[PDB]
From Swiss-Prot:
Stored Pfam families: Pep_deformylase
Functional summary from the UniProt entry: Removes the formyl group from the N-terminal Met of newly synthesized proteins. Requires at least a dipeptide for an efficient rate of reaction. N-terminal L-methionine is a prerequisite for activity but the enzyme has broad specificity at other positions.
Transmembrane segments: none
Protein source organism: Escherichia coli (strain K12)
GO molecular function: ferrous iron binding; hydrolase activity; peptide deformylase activity; ribosome binding; zinc ion binding
Subunit details: Monomer.
InterPro entries linked to this entry: Peptide_deformylase (IPR023635), Peptide_deformylase_sf (IPR036821)
EC number assigned by the record: 3.5.1.88
Comment on bound cofactor: Upon overproduction is isolated with 1 Fe(2+) ion per monomer, a Ni(2+)-bound form is as active while a Zn(2+)-bound form is inactive.
Binding, Fe cation: C90, H132, H136
Name listed for the protein in its UniProt record: Peptide deformylase
Amino acid sequence: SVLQVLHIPDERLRKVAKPVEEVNAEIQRIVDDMFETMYAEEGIGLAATQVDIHQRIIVIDVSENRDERLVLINPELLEKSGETGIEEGCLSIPEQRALVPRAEKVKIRALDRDGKPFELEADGLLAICIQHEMDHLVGKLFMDYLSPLKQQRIRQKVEKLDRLKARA
Ligand SMILES: [Zn+2]
């Protein structure tokens, strides 16, 4: 199922997710809808809190042909180093892009779809992704990194863009 993705200035985007208590079949069809919703909207990452499910689940797929879906359940950040930035977007901030300061290298622990723990070292687009998504789980959006001025115009451009969404 495709779920509805919240946009700013929705206050539910600012909620701190709870850790998943147990990875069962309820959890695994949250993951599936999250992937289906992600691909439907053409994103490379989606956090549960964006679909108004406030638990610690992130799906990511950077792939061309969808051969390596990545699931992070209860992600914890073990180490980071370096610094980069690319011009990021977000399904919850429609059509806006900004350079956000990120760590370049990141080591995480997490559970997969089967509740088995794995560790992942990531750089590049992956490491930027993981950070952006993990931010969602604690109520942080990428525009939070920007000047008060930069934030204003973002908020307005989006409001205008939904002004049309609910369309008629
Ligand atoms: Zn996002």
